[PDB]
Nucleic acid binder design. Structure first.
Lengths: 370, 185, 370, 158, 185
RNA sequence: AGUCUC
RNA sequence: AGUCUC
């Protein structure tokens, strides 16, 4: 008749498991005012605080399990009509110190997603909060300072009738965590850089609007008498010269109603904007479909004869810069029936088959991004 | 495997207070937080400290989880006006993983060569994560590596430069959000 | 890039599943004062209210799942030394109306467990809250009035130093629910009766203390100008005559320190207490080990020549009663070194190979139990 | 009971110390399957169900769902006096400090603790507290990182 | 195999007597018992000695049987007020397995650098048990390792810090019951 | 029967 | 690479 308490399975150390409904841990509702402008921080908080809103099916498991092996998965949701647009970014970083920067450049190197609700009305992202290993836990998230920033990279192209709200559902994923570490003097292939190259704006009209993005990407991003910096960009700055197959991810951060054909190519800083045969160089023409917002450009390393400086003195002129540039210009014209510039964001995602030479003593400061 | 001979990176430069008043006390103290990137000083006068925004200095401040070896070199450049025969100064160096007075020292040195001297030694980062350590995190009550100095007669042993060299096995993971690093001049 | 919300597994209708730790839904702490007396109600409430204390791993599943197929399992816990004792009962009933009775007789017919913490320090019980089917739900429990009574059947044999507390852990079991229905004019075999026969007390000394329990168990239990009644006893009362293999469950409700050998046998009401050869009838001798508290007696139907009345006129005398009785008397003596009577509780559990004749018009009232 | 067991046991302005604990104090961080041996040091007449689990220092005593963490319930038979608990290393996400500054508060302690509490009640018919002794017997599949410079002093044991 | 670069443990700090009277005698002496954990001093004045309760210091005092190598580092931090040209002090260091005057020296050094100097050397424990040795046990007339100093002009060569580093092969067995170690401040 | 125990 | 989509 007596139950043997010891035989009871009360000390089950297993990780959470089940359907998405069963693994839902929290839900956050981020406010998006109709007058939001871009650069605006929608919400910047400890990740532990986002994962702790609401008592869903796996909420007490999240709080009472010492090791979780599944990744954290979030499903963001919000739709807006095609005659408007806005670019939101949801970024994850291991820690934070002081009044850290919230610039898209500083925040997007670890695990970050940038989307345009006019094109993507439901967005999913999964990540490992502990890059050194294959498991995490809520205590670890709290005492470690794991951070989450949801910012608006580009404001509304046309303001909505009323205020908007983005809803984020948080889940423990079925996919296991996998580490991502950087051996400084021994980069892997591909080298995950995730460096923001700038926000390019092409105003409506027949103008060429030549854009020049330097590939001497070491030393961080320039700021007013300061430099912004993220970890992967910091490691690339340790090397003196580099080369590789560069992969860029181009995003349409403006309404589907503003059309424009952009032309990308590699060339040197000293060419005049009106160089007639820019398009005699190997180039690629980009046009976005109504609902398409992301395009991936890949520049083979045969567009580069030699490795170039990782860092160049910030005051160096377009005429004296001996390192290649990624050019972007309007092929035809930027046209629309509603007001607004055509705006795209460029992010250097990974460098494949990279090759680096020497160690860098360092140069003080760095040029401002777009 | 990227590598190049004789290329270290500047990390900090601490200049002893010009208005140090011998009469109040004879020594002064400052401490450099090697992994967090900060410099701490006395209320003994107006210190002139500086953390260079070199590649290694920027990397350490922004790398969330660290692991592996780093090489440290300290160079003391003193007061050339003092005749060698009048040299009466020495500096005690300490390596501790914390600024708390309750932590014992990992290592200790005392240098007194006239006019100038240098000190080179390696440090290694070992943490609880997966051998990775997060700067002073409350998590497993993690820590850092502090290099503290007690300068006796700050008017002779006046300047200190700290350089760091990264090793083939240094490995990091994750990013720490930091405010913009201020560029001088 | 766009996630398809429809494909997400957010509408999983499956029943809760997992380890005991994962299926824990609530925890109740019942107070047991050192001066408790027996007949005392420790806690009488809606089951839904017991299952809703505390936010454990399956607590929000309990509240957000429309059909649960596992039984409800409870693990009660509390230990007391051998030189004391108390008998607790935890009873479950489908519903309640008004200021219902809390007598051990009224409450123990559905799913009820009676234990003595001096013997059993951890007790488990599993049950189906919905006898008509194989699933239940929290809403069903609330709107249906499913009830739970935790009473003290017998007070402390020796009072503890301080107040006591019984802790009950509630879980969703892995065992599936199974129905238990009664077809009135077509009993199953065995017929589950669960009728309390009385609480027998044998005071210390050399006295025989003959106890007579009538087997004409129809019509409920007597009360002051009233009758108590439970469902299974109510169905047996529909029949006129009956017979069967009777199975009794005898519990030691007093401290292990009060020893006594009880003798059980079947005989008629008219025998004098001092009948010397009571033990010439087929009988069974019961003695409990220190830590033993339950014994099961089974009286074969060959101890009965014929079926007997299901109900007899309450005022009928021992001399005029023509139906058999279950006798219980002291074989040797009731002895102890501490004060207190030796007390046992008898419960007619099931009737096997029963055989009933005719329908019963009914007799008004009924005799009082022990 | 803090699991940052390095540095000996605290005493009045002193530390007590034994050899094996002294060697574990040489390392900076550690983890492992911990094995505890629990002894009933009081009379068989004082009954009590104790509940053991791993959690952090900052939880309030009245946290209702302490038992939502993986735990183990201990009850002793009359004549039983020893029980062995084994905490798998999957109850630990990461290695923790071997030694923590003694004055560290429950709120600021980032290392795990071995909790023990009454599941039901401590009852008896004779006077006396229910008393158990806990001894960390062996550490299996241990894993340690770094060398420890040392921290002065240590917290008092129970 | 646990290991980390540049992490020694503090073992002792001996400060020369402040009231040393040059007129009585010119030098003073103290000795550190490396394996037993004690410090011995002169009656030459009021010495300020201290044995830190660091991990290695606690281990050695409590490990009954020892075997293997240990690394020793001595750092002398002197009187910074003396001009380098007036330095007139030297200290003789001796390694003996016993304090008895009948035991010859295992090694000997003499350091006289102005203001400060350091000395690093390894010592190894070899015993009769199974290569294991018990501190000064009467058993096979076992012994220890003592580091003795003869400080000439205690007012210049004023302070001594002794740090110890444990090696990969250091191995111990058994426990020595010791009274509580006193925590300072 | 069930529940429980094993 | 990862994430995502399919």
């Amino acid at each position: 008749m007596e139950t043997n308490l010891f035989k009871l399975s009360l000390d089950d150390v297993e990780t959470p498991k089940g359907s998405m409904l069963d693994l839902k841990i929290s839900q956050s509702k981020i406010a998006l005012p109709k007058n939001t402008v871009g650069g605006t921080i929608l919400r910047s908080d400890l990740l532990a605080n986002f994962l702790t809103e609401g008592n869903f099916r796996a909420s007490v498991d999240l709080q009472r399990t010492h090791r979780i092996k599944g990744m954290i998965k979030m499903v963001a949701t919000v739709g807006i009509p095609e005659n408007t647009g806005i670019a939101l970014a949801c970024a994850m970083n291991s820690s934070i110190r002081g009044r850290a920067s919230s610039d898209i450049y500083t925040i997007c190197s670890q695990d970050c997603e940038l989307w345009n609700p006019a094109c993507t009305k439901a967005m999913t992202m999964s990540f490992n909060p502990n890059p050194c290993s294959d498991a995490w836990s809520l205590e670890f998230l709290k005492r470690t300072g794991f951070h989450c920033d949801i910012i608006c990279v580009t404001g509304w192209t046309a303001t909505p009738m009323q205020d908007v709200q983005v809803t984020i559902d948080w889940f423990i994923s079925s996919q296991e965590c996998v580490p991502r570490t950087y051996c400084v003097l021994n980069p892997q292939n591909p080298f995950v850089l995730n460096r923001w190259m700038g926000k390019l704006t092409f105003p409506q009209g027949t103008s060429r609007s030549v854009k020049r993005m330097p590939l001497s990407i070491g030393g961080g991003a320039g700021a007013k008498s300061a430099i912004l910096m993220n970890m992967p960009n910091a490691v690339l700055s340790m090397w003196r010269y580099f080369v590789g197959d560069l992969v860029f991810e181009v995003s349409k951060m403006t309404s589907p109603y503003i059309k424009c054909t952009v032309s990308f190519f590699i060339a040197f800083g000293n060419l005049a904007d009106d160089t007639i045969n820019f398009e005699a160089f190997p180039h690629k023409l980009v046009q976005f479909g109504e609902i398409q917002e992301k395009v991936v450009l890949k520049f083979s390393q045969e567009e580069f004869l030699t490795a170039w400086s990782t860092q160049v003195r910030p005051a160096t002129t377009l005429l004296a810069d001996g390192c290649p540039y990624l050019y972007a210009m309007v092929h035809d014209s930027s046209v629309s029936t509603i007001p607004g510039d055509f705006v795209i964001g460029v992010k250097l995602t990974i460098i494949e088959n990279m090759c680096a030479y020497g160690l860098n003593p360092g140069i003080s400061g760095s040029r401002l991004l777009g | 495997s990227i590598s190049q001979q004789t290329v270290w990176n500047q990390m900090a430069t601490v200049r002893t207070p010009l208005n140090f008043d011998s009469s109040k006390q004879s020594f002064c103290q400052f401490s450099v937080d090697l992994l967090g990137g900060g410099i701490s000083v006395d209320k003994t006068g107006d210190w002139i400290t500086l953390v260079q925004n070199s590649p290694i200095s920027n990397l350490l401040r922004v790398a969330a989880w660290k692991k592996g070896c780093l090489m440290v070199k300290v160079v003391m450049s003193g007061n050339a006006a003092v005749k060698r025969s009048d040299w009466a100064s020495l500096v005690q160096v300490f390596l501790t993983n914390s600024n708390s007075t309750e932590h014992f020292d990992a290592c200790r040195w005392t240098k007194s060569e006239p006019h100038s001297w240098e000190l080179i030694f390696p440090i290694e980062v070992c943490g609880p994560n997966n051998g990775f350590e997060m700067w002073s995190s409350e998590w497993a009550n993690q820590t850092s590596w502090h290099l503290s100095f007690l300068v006796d007669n700050p008017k002779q042993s006046t300047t200190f430069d700290v350089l760091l060299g990264i090793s083939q096995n240094f490995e990091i993971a994750g990013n720490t959000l930091m405010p913009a690093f201020s560029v001088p001049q």
